[PDB]
């Protein structure tokens, strides 16, 4: 889906598989978070459904030792003094020793502050222990988490339940036409993007000799030249748009290891899973009821939440007993209006516009010489049109799909290209879609705050600030204190201060709240980027202070207060909202669950081979299932005919479903259902 999605997959630890355990065999003990998981396997990153606890991500700092166990780095303390010497300890090698937490206060030399400090011990037991007994200590606060988990700002403010989803959903983020880096970060965004290998990193230092959208050439110091080709508009495993673009301008001095060009979901070599939108925390006209989401039309009018999706469509021509399938522009009983987008071969032309039902590749097959209808013979005598023996088996556009034809690949057995036994011509057609965001599209933040798009109001309908700026996303208040994920609120606060910029008051000395604040943050510019590492970063005292330092806009007026809130104006009525509303910026990701994909329906269609019931899935264009639990609901109501209708004339009554179609198109009455073919099968199975 995205580069992060890829990286995490490679860092997966599954207990399932041959030699391992089955899903049903796995009890409750296996799945829960073991003490030894510290620094080795993430306690948060794991699936939600029936696979919870059996799939985990490897922690950030851990590595695998030549025997197949999981080691992890610890700092060595000789005698109360922290040493830079680092040794990796296995799970059971850590149990015999005694470990201090990373955040324990250390002297500038390396000595501890207090005699008794926070200590980790065998069997997940914790106690205070004198400094003389401290063997090791943790490398980092963010040591126990994984890569994806470490990209969740203010993680220590969210319950494990939602934070679990936030991590799992980050891999579900869709690449947008161009990606912005989040205003609020953790620092992991950098190292994550680089190791992803879907960005472009310089191997040897030098200078950009030449740049194009196609490729970048680097003139090294020793005289040799290397050229990195850009992946341009390529289809992924999951129909996402892997497109890379150069960062550096021609003639830039670049050192080795530097990201010279980023790919999908990447801004300046940083994981860019979403956009930075102007958020408002308030229930609004019921359209955000039960975790739905309200959008500003700007996001459509400016392609803010727009993504690109490629589909790969295939068709082949085989040797049959009646001859062989041949791809041609000549298709029986088709007007030239429908073939207008084809080449002389019969293939769609590159750059053409296709809609659902249209023709991509014109293939015909010789049909079995069976005696044509004595009624159609007659009809072919009147109009004197001799029938062709070739039946249309052309590749048409599936229901739902739509876009522009961005590439044709053609293999022929003629041109010595190697095909499987029986295939002559095989054509591939790549069609992309520029999907703007629409209602029902799943939007979410890093804090397990998911939701489909309720309503996209016109840009004028959006509640707005004093200087006229309309918000982008209206999140519903009710769905916050329940989930315990108020990290999304802290993010918005820091998100505003990052957008507005700030300045701590240095007069009369450095303030006591901003005492622990590193020197580089006492002064920030509008649209500045900041880190808030997990189990570190900003604290509640500083965040309150920063809201006070909020630099005014262009008009010289401050927009939000120290509470973090501001005054809004209802764009519909005009009157200002009666109470202060919390306003700032929140990083929102576009997940890969879009209505264009999820929507599906069917009147009639294909059917099963044995049970004669409808097939299953959108891909097969099948009907929904009205199962056992659904049947109880019908039986409960006392809706006899509806329930009968569903399982007979709607399902597998061979003569029935046919005699239902006619009755409808003739405008008659629905006949009395027959015997479900599925039952007959049962009877012949019993025999």
């Amino acid at each position: 889906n995205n580069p992060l999605s890829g990286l995490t997959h490679k860092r997966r630890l599954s207990a399932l598989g041959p030699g391992g355990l089955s899903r049903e065999r796995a009890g409750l003990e296996v799945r829960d978070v073991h003490p030894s998981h510290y620094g080795r396997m993430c306690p948060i990153e794991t699936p939600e459904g029936p696979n919870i606890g059996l799939i985990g991500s490897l922690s950030v700092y851990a590595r695998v030792n030549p025997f197949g166990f999981i080691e992890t780095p610890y700092r060595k303390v000789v005698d109360g003094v922290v040493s830079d010497e680092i040794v990796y300890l296995t799970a059971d090698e850590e149990d015999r020793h005694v470990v201090a937490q990373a955040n324990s206060p250390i002297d500038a030399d390396g000595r501890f502050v207090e005699p008794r400090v926070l200590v980790r011990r065998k069997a997940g037991e914790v106690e205070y222990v004198p400094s003389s007994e401290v063997d090791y200590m943790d490398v980092s606060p963010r040591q126990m988490v994984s890569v994806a988990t470490a990209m969740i700002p203010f993680l220590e403010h969210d319950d494990a339940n939602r934070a679990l989803m936030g991590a799992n959903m980050q891999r579900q983020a869709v690449p947008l036409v161009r990606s912005e880096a989040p205003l609020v970060g953790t620092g992991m965004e950098l190292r994550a993007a680089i190791d992803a290998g879907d960005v472009v990193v310089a191997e040897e230092s030098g200078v950009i000799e030449e740049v194009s959208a196609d490729y970048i050439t680097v003139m090294h110091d020793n005289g040799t030249r290397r050229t990195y080709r850009m992946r341009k508009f390529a289809r992924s495993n999951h129909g996402t748009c892997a497109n890379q673009c150069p960062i550096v301008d021609a003639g830039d001095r670049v050192e080795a290891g530097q990201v010279i060009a980023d790919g999908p979901c990447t801004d300046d070599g940083e994981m860019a899973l979403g956009k930075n939108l102007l958020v408002a925390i308030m229930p609004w006209e019921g359209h955000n009821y039960e975790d739905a989401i309200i959008l500003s039309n700007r996001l459509v009018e400016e392609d803010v939440l727009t993504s690109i999706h490629i589909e790969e469509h295939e068709i082949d021509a085989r040797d049959t007993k009646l001859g062989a399938e041949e791809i041609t522009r000549d298709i029986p009983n088709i007007s030239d209006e429908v073939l207008a987008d084809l080449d002389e071969r019969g293939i769609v032309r590159i750059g053409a516009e296709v809609r659902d039902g249209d023709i991509l590749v014109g293939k015909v097959t010789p049909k079995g010489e069976t005696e044509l209808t004595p009624e159609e013979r007659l009809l072919r005598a009147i109009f004197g049109e001799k029938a062709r023996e070739v039946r249309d088996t052309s590749l048409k556009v599936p229901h739902g799909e739509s876009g522009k034809v961005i590439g044709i690949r053609v293999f022929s057995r003629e041109d010595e290209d190697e095909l499987p036994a029986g295939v002559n011509e095989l054509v591939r057609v790549y069609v992309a879609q520029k999907r703007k965001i629409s209602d029902g599209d799943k939007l979410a933040g890093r804090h397990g705050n998911k939701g489909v798009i309720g309503k996209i109001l016109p840009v004028e309908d959006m509640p707005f600030l004093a200087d006229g700026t309309p918000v982008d996303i209206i999140l519903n208040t009710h769905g916050v204190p329940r989930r315990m994920n108020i990290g999304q609120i802290l993010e918005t606060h820091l998100g505003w201060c990052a957008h507005s910029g700030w300045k701590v008051d240095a007069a009369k000395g450095v303030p006591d709240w901003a005492a622990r604040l590193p020197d580089e943050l006492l002064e920030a510019q509008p649209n500045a980027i900041v880190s808030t590492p997990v189990f570190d970063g900003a604290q509640e005292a500083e965040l309150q202070g920063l809201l006070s330092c909020t630099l005014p806009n262009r008009d010289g007026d401050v927009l939000v207060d120290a509470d973090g809130k501001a005054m809004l104006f209802d764009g519909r009525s005009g009157e200002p909202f009666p109470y202060p509303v919390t306003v700032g910026y929140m990083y929102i990701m576009k997940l890969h669950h879009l209505v264009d994909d999820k929507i599906h329906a069917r009147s009639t269609g294909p059917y099963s081979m044995i049970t004669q019931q409808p097939l299953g899935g959108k891909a097969q264009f099948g009907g929904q299932r009205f199962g056992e639990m659904e049947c109880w609901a019908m039986q409960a109501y006392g809706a006899a005919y509806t329930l009968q209708e569903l399982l007979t004339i709607k399902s597998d009554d061979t003569v029935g479903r046919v005699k239902v179609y006619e009755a409808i198109v003739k405008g008659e009455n629905i006949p009395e259902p027959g015997i479900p073919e599925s039952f007959k099968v049962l009877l012949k199975e019993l025999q």
Binding site: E189, E520, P533, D536
Partner: peptide, 23 residues
Amino acid sequence: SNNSVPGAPNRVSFAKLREPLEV
């Protein structure tokens, strides 16, 4: 700064100084 190793955009950080070892 947080990761001043590759040649990256400066992402200022609320922190206690983290110098044990890079990811």
